[PDB]
Amino acid sequence: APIRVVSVPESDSFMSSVPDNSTPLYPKVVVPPRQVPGRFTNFIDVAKQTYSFCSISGKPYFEVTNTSGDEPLFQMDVSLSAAELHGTYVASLSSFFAQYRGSLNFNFIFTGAAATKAKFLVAFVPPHSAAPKTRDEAMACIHAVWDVGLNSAFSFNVPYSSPADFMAVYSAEATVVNVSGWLQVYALTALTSTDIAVNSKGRVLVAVSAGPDFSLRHPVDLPDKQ
Amino acid sequence: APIRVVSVPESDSFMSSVPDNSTPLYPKVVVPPRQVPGRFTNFIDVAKQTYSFCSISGKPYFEVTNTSGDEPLFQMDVSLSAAELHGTYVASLSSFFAQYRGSLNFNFIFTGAAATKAKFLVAFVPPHSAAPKTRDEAMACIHAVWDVGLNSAFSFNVPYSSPADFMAVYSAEATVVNVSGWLQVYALTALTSTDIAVNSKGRVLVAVSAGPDFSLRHPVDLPDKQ
Amino acid sequence: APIRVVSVPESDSFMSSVPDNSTPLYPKVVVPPRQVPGRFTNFIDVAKQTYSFCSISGKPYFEVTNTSGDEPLFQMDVSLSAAELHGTYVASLSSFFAQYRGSLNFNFIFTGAAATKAKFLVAFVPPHSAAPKTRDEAMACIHAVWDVGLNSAFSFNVPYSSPADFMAVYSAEATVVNVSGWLQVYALTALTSTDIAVNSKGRVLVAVSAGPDFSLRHPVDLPDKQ
């Protein structure tokens, strides 16, 4: 009658994430009904239905002035480890995982006065020797022309382009699964105003959301701070 | 979730004949078809369908001569430990077991020339004070008259007679389950021949088979030789 | 309620090839679709659908010249441990196993110029005192006549002939399950050419494939190199 059993070598070990529960010692507790609004079941949903502001030089926006042209106003490399993605929800949620997949949605909100106007060219530049320095260079790439004064807000989707099905959350010296290129914003025209003495500059807030195809996998433990 | 289990005291022991198998480490081996004739599945069948010759004084037979009468020509006590059953298949197979049940079939084959003739009286004598010394004494028992020259071979069945359902294979000083009596063969008439100078004696081969009701139980390990 | 259990003696041991899995600690990972061409599921299929070149004196071929006749041009003993089977896929795959069964298919490809011609006699010689030295000797055996200039390539099947259902992959001093005989190729005629100064010799490439009935069993670990 006693059952012949063979003890596996990994026997008395711990294994932290076993797919099984411990023995219960305090049964039959019926818990009170928890009505309460706003329950969420998956972090990816709040990442997709919500936006955070980027950290451009410590502020949540870049500026256009009545003197601008050529040079890029905003530039960030496409990696969740990028600096301008620092204080964001999507970037911060990501540190819990090893890999990501999908697009990021950026939306720019021009907060310059109603008496103010400017036009922007926003480009997604794929991995390359070295990042364009002027807009005539970048305009060969995927880009959109944002004329404020048509819509004060503009959404741009940074796509996912890679031979790998997922890329790394934690970047490092450039690898083929580390970085996906750059996102740049140029001034197609400098800020014009009704009176340059009253309005000389206007600020574009830049916010990020997880794209519809965005996903995160492989939960990871936090490494030494840096 | 972990199952409450209680370790029996006989826990880490060996127990040689457990009715269960060990864990397999070299799976999926398909074995070649083994046609080959003469497979046997039970030793009792080969013991019943086969005969061996007894060991009467080291030879497989007893002799009748032209001078015989009274005295027994062959005598063996009914026990598998008997001497004359020594080199036989049935006796030898038996040493693997503790107990036996059933009858033994003996068949005598007269190999004296065709010009020779004799008559035998074969008796099964039950346990008794001391074994008959002459045939007029034994003839009161179960016996058969074998006239050679009618049939050259003769089969005689030593029966199983005992209050116990099985008797011992390994005999010793006489007990109630040790010995079942004696098998004796007498010469009813001495050997007659066409010329006594040419044929003065004839030999009767004696062979044993397991009877139809014969059986062996309780496999046992071999003790010190003796 | 606690279940009576008896711990087998082989209890806390390792046993490397147990037919069972370990406990999972990192669940629910859905793996990306792996389209990718050319998946193979059994090594025997690639061994049968593919050919390798033999190693005759370090080259993948034997030569016929305008001076040849009698003597064998190619000779190899039928054993996967043979030298001329050295660099092949079938021989190399075999070292992972202890036993083999079946035939080997050899195909000779004459690469001598179109202005060149010769005839070969290829024989399968069964185990014997000592291997034939001339073709008139071998021609008593299973053989085929290959007239180049009829077909430039010729396939010959070395059969499996043995009292055992499988033979050894790893040969050694000749045993009954070590070697199956010899494969020899003779020149029925020497190379003829349109101009002996331009073409004096022609090379026959020899390739091997696993036959249709070929099989390998018993995976084995690699022994000391030799």
């Binding site: 099984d20 529960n21 049964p27 818990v31 | - | 669940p27």
Partner: peptide, 21 residues
């Protein structure tokens, strides 16, 4: 989420966890 044994219900649903009203 993260209980994948067939034996996860070795103890009844009311003994193993709490129960919502």
């Amino acid at each position: 989420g993260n209980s994948g044994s067939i034996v996860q219900n070795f103890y009844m649903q009311q003994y193993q966890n709490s129960i919502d009203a």
